[PDB]
Design a protein around this motif. Structure first.
Motif, PDB file in Angstrom:
ATOM      1  N   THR A 170      -3.508   0.184   4.155  1.00  0.00           N
ATOM      2  CA  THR A 170      -2.907   1.510   4.207  1.00  0.00           C
ATOM      3  C   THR A 170      -1.969   1.676   5.381  1.00  0.00           C
ATOM      4  O   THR A 170      -2.241   1.207   6.497  1.00  0.00           O
ATOM      5  CB  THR A 170      -4.007   2.581   4.332  1.00  0.00           C
ATOM      6  OG1 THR A 170      -4.968   2.163   5.314  1.00  0.00           O
ATOM      7  CG2 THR A 170      -4.723   2.757   3.006  1.00  0.00           C
ATOM      8  N   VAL A 171      -0.855   2.355   5.113  1.00  0.00           N
ATOM      9  CA  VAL A 171       0.140   2.632   6.145  1.00  0.00           C
ATOM     10  C   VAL A 171      -0.428   3.770   7.000  1.00  0.00           C
ATOM     11  O   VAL A 171      -0.222   4.937   6.697  1.00  0.00           O
ATOM     12  CB  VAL A 171       1.477   3.064   5.505  1.00  0.00           C
ATOM     13  CG1 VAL A 171       1.219   4.049   4.385  1.00  0.00           C
ATOM     14  CG2 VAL A 171       2.390   3.697   6.582  1.00  0.00           C
ATOM     15  N   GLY A 172      -1.138   3.398   8.050  1.00  0.00           N
ATOM     16  CA  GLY A 172      -1.727   4.428   8.898  1.00  0.00           C
ATOM     17  C   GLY A 172      -3.144   4.684   8.416  1.00  0.00           C
ATOM     18  O   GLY A 172      -3.453   4.393   7.266  1.00  0.00           O
TER      19      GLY A 172
ATOM     20  N   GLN B 173      -5.541   7.555  -4.325  1.00  0.00           N
ATOM     21  CA  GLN B 173      -4.438   6.602  -4.482  1.00  0.00           C
ATOM     22  C   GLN B 173      -4.799   5.505  -5.474  1.00  0.00           C
ATOM     23  O   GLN B 173      -4.061   5.237  -6.415  1.00  0.00           O
ATOM     24  CB  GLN B 173      -4.089   5.989  -3.125  1.00  0.00           C
ATOM     25  CG  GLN B 173      -3.439   6.957  -2.146  1.00  0.00           C
ATOM     26  CD  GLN B 173      -1.947   7.091  -2.352  1.00  0.00           C
ATOM     27  OE1 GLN B 173      -1.199   6.103  -2.233  1.00  0.00           O
ATOM     28  NE2 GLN B 173      -1.495   8.293  -2.671  1.00  0.00           N
TER      29      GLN B 173
ATOM     30  N   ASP C 217       0.607   1.366  12.346  1.00  0.00           N
ATOM     31  CA  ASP C 217       0.624   0.030  11.784  1.00  0.00           C
ATOM     32  C   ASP C 217       0.259   0.081  10.288  1.00  0.00           C
ATOM     33  O   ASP C 217      -0.110   1.128   9.760  1.00  0.00           O
ATOM     34  CB  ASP C 217      -0.405  -0.837  12.514  1.00  0.00           C
ATOM     35  CG  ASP C 217      -0.107  -2.321  12.391  1.00  0.00           C
ATOM     36  OD1 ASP C 217       0.980  -2.765  12.862  1.00  0.00           O
ATOM     37  OD2 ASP C 217      -0.977  -3.056  11.848  1.00  0.00           O
TER      38      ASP C 217
ATOM     39  N   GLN D 139      -2.302  -1.766   7.951  1.00  0.00           N
ATOM     40  CA  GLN D 139      -3.453  -2.652   7.846  1.00  0.00           C
ATOM     41  C   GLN D 139      -4.638  -1.961   7.206  1.00  0.00           C
ATOM     42  O   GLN D 139      -4.554  -0.818   6.781  1.00  0.00           O
ATOM     43  CB  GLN D 139      -3.859  -3.182   9.237  1.00  0.00           C
ATOM     44  CG  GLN D 139      -4.544  -2.164  10.130  1.00  0.00           C
ATOM     45  CD  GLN D 139      -4.455  -2.533  11.597  1.00  0.00           C
ATOM     46  OE1 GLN D 139      -3.424  -2.294  12.233  1.00  0.00           O
ATOM     47  NE2 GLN D 139      -5.532  -3.094  12.141  1.00  0.00           N
TER      48      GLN D 139
ATOM     49  N   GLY E  97      -2.581   7.255   5.808  1.00  0.00           N
ATOM     50  CA  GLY E  97      -1.407   7.041   4.979  1.00  0.00           C
ATOM     51  C   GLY E  97      -1.758   6.466   3.612  1.00  0.00           C
ATOM     52  O   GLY E  97      -2.905   6.107   3.367  1.00  0.00           O
ATOM     53  N   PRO E  98      -0.775   6.351   2.702  1.00  0.00           N
ATOM     54  CA  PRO E  98      -0.992   5.816   1.356  1.00  0.00           C
ATOM     55  C   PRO E  98      -1.282   4.317   1.301  1.00  0.00           C
ATOM     56  O   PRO E  98      -1.295   3.616   2.315  1.00  0.00           O
ATOM     57  CB  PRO E  98       0.299   6.178   0.604  1.00  0.00           C
ATOM     58  CG  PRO E  98       1.008   7.173   1.495  1.00  0.00           C
ATOM     59  CD  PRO E  98       0.633   6.792   2.880  1.00  0.00           C
ATOM     60  N   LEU E  99      -1.510   3.851   0.068  1.00  0.00           N
ATOM     61  CA  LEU E  99      -1.826   2.462  -0.238  1.00  0.00           C
ATOM     62  C   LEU E  99      -0.616   1.640  -0.682  1.00  0.00           C
ATOM     63  O   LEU E  99       0.254   2.131  -1.395  1.00  0.00           O
ATOM     64  CB  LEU E  99      -2.864   2.400  -1.316  1.00  0.00           C
ATOM     65  CG  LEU E  99      -3.963   1.341  -1.165  1.00  0.00           C
ATOM     66  CD1 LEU E  99      -4.870   1.413  -2.370  1.00  0.00           C
ATOM     67  CD2 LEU E  99      -3.359  -0.047  -1.039  1.00  0.00           C
TER      68      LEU E  99
ATOM     69  N   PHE F 224      -7.728  -0.139   7.627  1.00  0.00           N
ATOM     70  CA  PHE F 224      -8.472   0.672   8.590  1.00  0.00           C
ATOM     71  C   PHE F 224      -9.879   0.966   8.097  1.00  0.00           C
ATOM     72  O   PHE F 224     -10.078   1.561   7.033  1.00  0.00           O
ATOM     73  CB  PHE F 224      -7.724   1.969   8.854  1.00  0.00           C
ATOM     74  CG  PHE F 224      -6.408   1.764   9.536  1.00  0.00           C
ATOM     75  CD1 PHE F 224      -6.354   1.377  10.872  1.00  0.00           C
ATOM     76  CD2 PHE F 224      -5.217   1.891   8.825  1.00  0.00           C
ATOM     77  CE1 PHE F 224      -5.136   1.102  11.494  1.00  0.00           C
ATOM     78  CE2 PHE F 224      -3.986   1.626   9.447  1.00  0.00           C
ATOM     79  CZ  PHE F 224      -3.950   1.237  10.781  1.00  0.00           C
TER      80      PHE F 224
ATOM     81  N   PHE G  41       4.990   8.922   7.693  1.00  0.00           N
ATOM     82  CA  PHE G  41       3.738   8.267   8.064  1.00  0.00           C
ATOM     83  C   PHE G  41       3.999   7.194   9.101  1.00  0.00           C
ATOM     84  O   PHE G  41       4.739   6.223   8.856  1.00  0.00           O
ATOM     85  CB  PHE G  41       3.099   7.633   6.825  1.00  0.00           C
ATOM     86  CG  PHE G  41       2.277   8.601   6.010  1.00  0.00           C
ATOM     87  CD1 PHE G  41       1.122   9.159   6.542  1.00  0.00           C
ATOM     88  CD2 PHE G  41       2.688   8.971   4.720  1.00  0.00           C
ATOM     89  CE1 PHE G  41       0.380  10.051   5.788  1.00  0.00           C
ATOM     90  CE2 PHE G  41       1.941   9.862   3.975  1.00  0.00           C
ATOM     91  CZ  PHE G  41       0.780  10.414   4.510  1.00  0.00           C
ATOM     92  N   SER G  42       3.380   7.376  10.259  1.00  0.00           N
ATOM     93  CA  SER G  42       3.542   6.433  11.358  1.00  0.00           C
ATOM     94  C   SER G  42       2.226   5.683  11.551  1.00  0.00           C
ATOM     95  O   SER G  42       1.164   6.146  11.124  1.00  0.00           O
ATOM     96  CB  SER G  42       3.900   7.184  12.640  1.00  0.00           C
ATOM     97  OG  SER G  42       4.149   6.285  13.716  1.00  0.00           O
TER      98      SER G  42
END
Ligand code: HEM
Lengths: 499, 499, 499, 499
Positions: free
Chosen positions: A40-42, D349, D425, D427, A45-47, D429, D422-423
């Motif tokens: 996930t971006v953040g 998602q 990295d 990965q 954040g989304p997938l 999480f 969306f900020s």
């Protein structure tokens, strides 16, 4: 400690000694580093489509379920073998009956009929008892029930029947009006109806029940002579049924009753066996029979046609992966090796088609290419190629047309279907009025005692009551025709249920 | 006598030897006593359902066809290996590069792009060059083609492209308007379009063409350090194209020319070979790069990015059965071993999804179980079960939930994706105008010489001419942008072509 | 402004001029904002699995391809009508010939045989001429061939035949060794094989080839009075065919020549037509007939069995969507309404099984509902239900069992199939020797003139020359069995070919 | 007279009166003469291939089945409409809310979860609640549940979770060792696992439960401002749960309690209804909030985020044909009109992919073309074509590539997706530590009273009483981590069950 059943995952990690665990991987065999937290971006954040680990699994997960059996969806399975203890090579020249002590590996599956996959075992319905014989000549499937007779005698009325027993096209509920309008308009069921609502209706597990090929078949000897036969493999565990009472309690306490009774029986080591017999009727005797020797709604009285022991069916290995080996199976009556052939039994003639028909659909074109269904004690070879999901093979780069001049597979005249002469016109010959009472009467007041005789009239009425009145009579009438009292008892009961 | 290819059956039989043929069986392995005459009542009477021989066979024949690949339906396949002539382990830590000398069994399928299964190899069109590595860490499907650049930069416009490049929805014919209207509306196509109509548009046989991965990729080493790279494999058989007439001729004389060339070259020991190279680029450089490093339409110049030698690609094996080994060969760009990751290539990103998505529909949910596709060099253990046509045991009784406390498949902290950090509003960024000329202008002038240019246009002019005057304008217009002359030079031909 | 086929998209835009474009939507109908750039986190970041526009469109693109017809993969399709013009009702009570001026919608498809989807039209190959009538009594499919005869005379040796024709199991190239080895081993093909290699083997477009039923069928009038028959429908456009030279040129120039030709004609009011006659053989005649009257490799001479005019076949409506209308198009010889029945022609009988079968695989279980296939001019009402992709109302609440007392559909005892008498033993009667030359000789000597016999042998030799020597030998032999000249004229050519 | 469900056929005949029954035909609409006696050669002869009435009917039956939903197989469905009652035009610009009193056709299916198609309705299992709003912007599937939370907050786990609930891979029986193991090793379940065993575990009828959009979503107004929200559709007929013994009684007395119950209501005018509310949370607030505002195992409190009113859900129409309308129904969360958008939910998602995907499997590629799935209150127009069972017209002759110059479907910027920055990295999480006990404790204590509190422990123990002690322990370790007495009482109970 619990039973061998529940202790499954338990008895699995154990035997897995101290050998490390395999490395989780995707279908492609890529070692999965983290299969618990999606990419996930953040953290909020989304997938990403990039998480292929995920995609790879979800994708596979979304496609597990395949169409369940069009009939007999719910059942159990297990493997074992067959062993010879008698010589009948005089009758049939099949390789499975070769010499005495000739053990052929088998595969059998028990099941219900009318219910879906989520249904429970313990309930009034015939039972699916189908054996898969792996012979050097190929596979031999004895797709049989817990009785030598069925409800109808013409394949055409079968689809309509299975419908009459399964849900309503609109409500999706079980509909007695249907169950009985069909039965009522089709008295041929009489015989097998009575057998159903008898005590046998619900055995105790899949073991304390009997097996039959139901239909009439044809044996052939190495001498080209043939004779019609009937297969009967009785239970060596003894016959045992369950009161309408338990059948209901079990219906919810352990919907998979019969299922785990079979697994533990074999897990604990108490392997279920059955003694195979066969009746024998010559063509001469066939022309004589006071009835259609090929009518599925009839039996050959034991007195006039005694049983000959032939073998011992012993299930001793429990299936490992159920899906692959049990649900994925495929019992096709069509699969019959030399020395065995179908009789002109219209219902049997129907199974010659339907099974491979559906199988190709349920499992797919190469449904025989599935390990469980592949006849390994043989050497399949011919002129067939391709098809979706073609494993093996695909019969190598060998020539593909017959005939050929390149040493590709040749036929074997020693397996030619036994030739019989048939005369008569081609027409839709009516079998409806083929006497649907006699043998029935001698079963109401000859096979059953007063105790079960009543248990019957009770069981039947308890269901009939729910059908429209006009229906009830149309039924009582038929029953009556088997014997007045029969319809008298029932009808009586009905009215009491009828308020 | 003649060629090895045409001598297929011959040899097969000579190897067969004196070994008597196999008994011709049915799918069920049952021997057939006569598979040349049907079971008919009378010598001129009806056919019987009872002929399970006919039905068995006929039926499998009815299911011999699976949908051809959506694109690149026509092709040829061969197996072989890959060698490590160098240590490139400083960038990528994939086990397929472990140590110089190590070899990894490969599988490759060359194909055209548009034409269905029946078209002709010798026609202008890009070319499919798929290289499947069977490593010990799963697989690696490097779906290459002969060109490092393509027509579009975003997947979304891909399904649309292939369309224009196929039969008009109503007539079913190749549409010049469908083609050129699209190409004209999307200049980004200006690059490969050129490369496409050039002498490389028709490579003489597969062996005589290069292969590329196009998409920028990711190489992760031991320390976890990463980089972006390209994959180029130069043909050891040297480049060789086919003149319009020499190809347009072979279109009929031998539509499967490419397929035959390969099989034959191999069958005669003369194995085709390719050297593998790659281009390395630092996130820093990729930062500086004058263009979008993940723009499929562009290339990483040799000078600024030399090709490091990797290993060798030998094709020393021919398929046994084509339908089972090639037709079914499935390549999913997703199969990347821990050590090779994708790149933000908007174009590649899409493929990540598509290949398995379609493979799940063309071959089946369990296609990864097909012998050819199976990663037979790693141990596939995970929590995915069932699915239609489940081969092997289906992880027998092993559990199915993760995590679990029963010693089932584990993680691989080593096989964790590299962690890149992006930024910016998540949206839909228009990539339509990211320089669709530069490199095209460098191709049309510095790469080609006058006679090579002359051709290009005539090649283009001869096809574009069948489009509507308006598209022709739009088309020429884009060409001028790459260069004034390019345009006019072609235009000229059109006016003449309009006779 | 070119040929109507090219301007397809033109007349479209044109067709809906003032009408503003419709909104672009996903499968679900949701409107689409920007369909050009996928949703990537950052102008150079990954692709969000959150982007549905992509996935939706892409996933569908990924499943566009369905299997291509087993044989006859490449074809053309148009819709038109049929108009009765002769009272033949004294031979068939078929509601289609019901009465002068009668109009029944039809749908036809032309085809080659061996080539796959990309295959060229102008090649030597029989031609498929399958008509579909939407009669008031249900669809009546009459699957015609551009020849009134076929190679083999038993349905079992068919999958083998086609195999020999198509690609080799290994190389995947057409194998002349395969082809001729086959024909050489089954001389019944002589007749058809001879026709095939005659000018008629490559008709110039579909508009210049007769269509035939080939098989003998049984007609049944109002008094259940029968009579066998042959179906012929000659072109009203004149017999025309492409030389071996124009055919090869066109082969690469215009692979879709038949398509283009057929489309254009109609598109420009130049409608093709066919007159349909039928020969009438009575049961008494088929009896003393010098050959088996149900042998697909034989014909009833015009002399002893004339042709009675019926009506006309007219095509005046191009397909709008090829896939949906010409592709999914499936014809079942089994579809015959009251009055049009089958004969014991073994070759025919098999077809009763395979067409619906294969269709249940290529198109799917519920393909009879596909618009172009539904008998829209009839009203289905049966106890059939469910299956995947089930449209219409699945007959809704309607009862699902038969018989039922709830007013569901019944059986019309007036459409009960005719009844014939067949007696004898039931078995595999070997019909491989029922004269494989007589008629062949008549064709070679009386139907062709020197000019023709010359091209024929040349043609035969053109291909055969490549078959191993022992094969050619065996081949000339047979031809000689038709006529010394025949085999020789070729032989020379052979020896000639071999340097 | 009895209930509506029972009088199904009774009514069909009644209303379908004053009408001659339809003519029973074949798949192709041919009238059948007699559909009760297969065609044979003589009264006691084999079935002929000739019999097509048979095959057609049989084959079609041999396929009636399609795979069931991997989850939520057992269910009941009905149709109704959504009525706007309040203006939230500011939160959503969605047409389905355009004005006050706006009706929108909806479809709904209620379903249990881990239970197969044949299973029984009344069992501790969450209830599936999915509404299909057919709006002018296409269909918006609100795939809800009768609970606002789930057992896990990461798609990846799902397959692993779902498997734990289903059957054992080897013994095929339901297995607690798996159940509790999963949950024991996964504490996030706690919240939802409590709610389950609560009094809400077995709702009486489908009408006496609630609906919860469950996930978190986004809303966008005409001005483009976005916000997050929670969906709630509270039952109007009021909450009424079933006891534990009662549940297990109807479990076998009437396993189809849901279907019947719900069907009958609508059948008599007693149409059930639900009120749709929305909780709103602004990004700002989405920031202040204190655990993840998307954690699927976390619910917004009416306290801080109050329930806003929206409209009514009224179901006043029963399915006519169940298989056609409920079995084939497909709800894809991915379907969302403008104004509605997904949220980061690592659980949601993933759903956006599983639903349309798994559908292309269970139903088929063009499933959205099945009458009930089609977005009929809109107008599908795009560049998607082909695929099997392509109903409709495939979109006719329209241009198939985008962009194009032939006025084909255009796009609407209005439908562009809201852009969120969306900020962070990119990965995996970890989400195992996002608090899985705070909110939970609040239930057991606040929302729950002493009484129900007892029935939970009793239930949570009545089940766990079959999992290897070592497991039982781990479990108590969490429940107590929730609140001392929670595990305390449990553990107290468990001990007795341990005999
Ligand atoms: C019993 C043997 C037969 C079998 C099993 C059989 C099988 C097939 C198959 C699988 C196809 C492919 C059709 C397609 O993909 O479109 C086909 C096509 C065809 N068959 Fe043969 N067939 C048989 C006999 C014949 C005969 C007896 C006729 C005489 C009408 C015939 C006429 C056709 C025609 C016209 C086509 C092409 C249909 C079209 O593309 O429009 N077939 N057949």
């Amino acid at each position: 400690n619990r039973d061998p059943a529940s202790d499954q995952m338990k008895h699995w990690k154990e035997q897995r000694a101290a050998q490390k665990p395999d490395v989780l991987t995707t279908g492609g065999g890529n070692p999965v580093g983290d299969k618990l937290n999606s990419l996930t971006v953040g953290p909020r954040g989304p997938l990403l489509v990039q998480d292929v680990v995920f995609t790879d699994e979800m994708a596979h997960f979304d496609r597990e379920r395949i169409p369940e059996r069009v009939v007999h969806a719910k059942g159990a399975g297990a493997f074992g073998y067959f062993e010879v203890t008698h010589d009948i090579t005089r009758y049939s020249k099949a390789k499975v009956f070769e010499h005495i002590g000739k053990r052929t590996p088998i595969a059998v599956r028990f099941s219900t009929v009318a219910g879906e996959s989520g249904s429970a075992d313990t309930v009034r319905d015939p039972r699916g008892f189908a054996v898969k014989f792996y012979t050097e000549d190929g596979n031999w499937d004895l797709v049989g029930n817990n009785t030598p007779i069925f409800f109808i005698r013409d394949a055409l009325l079968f689809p309509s029947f299975i419908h009459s027993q399964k849900r309503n096209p609109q409500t999706h509920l079980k509909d007695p009006d249907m169950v009985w309008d069909f039965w009522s308009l089709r008295p041929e069921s009489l015989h097998q109806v009575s057998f159903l609502f008898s005590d046998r209706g619900i055995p105790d597990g899949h073991r304390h029940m009997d097996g039959y090929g139901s239909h009439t078949f044809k044996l052939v000897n190495a001498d080209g002579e043939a004779v019609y036969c009937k297969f009967h493999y009785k239970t060596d565990q003894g016959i045992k049924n369950l009161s309408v009472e338990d059948a209901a309690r079990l219906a919810h306490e352990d919907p998979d009753y019969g299922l785990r009774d079979l697994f533990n029986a074999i897990a604990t080591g108490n392997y279920p066996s059955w003694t195979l017999y066969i009746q024998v009727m010559t063509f001469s005797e066939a022309e004589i029979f006071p009835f259609n020797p090929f009518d599925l709604t009839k039996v050959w009285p034991h007195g006039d046609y005694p049983l000959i022991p032939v073998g011992k069916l012993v299930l001793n290995r429990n299936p490992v992966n159920y899906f692959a080996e049990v649900e994925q199976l495929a019992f096709d009556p069509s699969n019959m090796p030399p020395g065995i052939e179908p009789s002109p039994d219209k219902m049997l003639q129907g199974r010659l088609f339907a099974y491979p028909d559906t199988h190709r659909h349920r499992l797919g074109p190469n449904y025989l290419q599935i390990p469980v269904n592949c006849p390994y004690r043989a050497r399949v070879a011919n002129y067939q190629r391709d098809g979706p999901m073609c494993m093996m093979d695909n019969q190598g780069g060998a020539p593909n047309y017959y005939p050929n001049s390149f040493s590709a597979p040749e036929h074997q005249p020693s397996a030619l279907e036994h030739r019989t002469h048939f005369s008569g016109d081609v027409q839709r010959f009516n079998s409806a009025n083929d006497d649907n009472v006699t043998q029935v009467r001698t079963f109401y007041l000859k096979v059953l005692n007063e105790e079960q005789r009543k248990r019957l009239c009770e069981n039947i009425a308890g269901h009939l009551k729910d059908a429209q009145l006009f229906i009830q009579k149309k039924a009582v009438k038929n029953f009556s025709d088997v014997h007045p009292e029969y319809g008298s008892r029932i009808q009586a009961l009905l009215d009491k249920y009828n308020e």
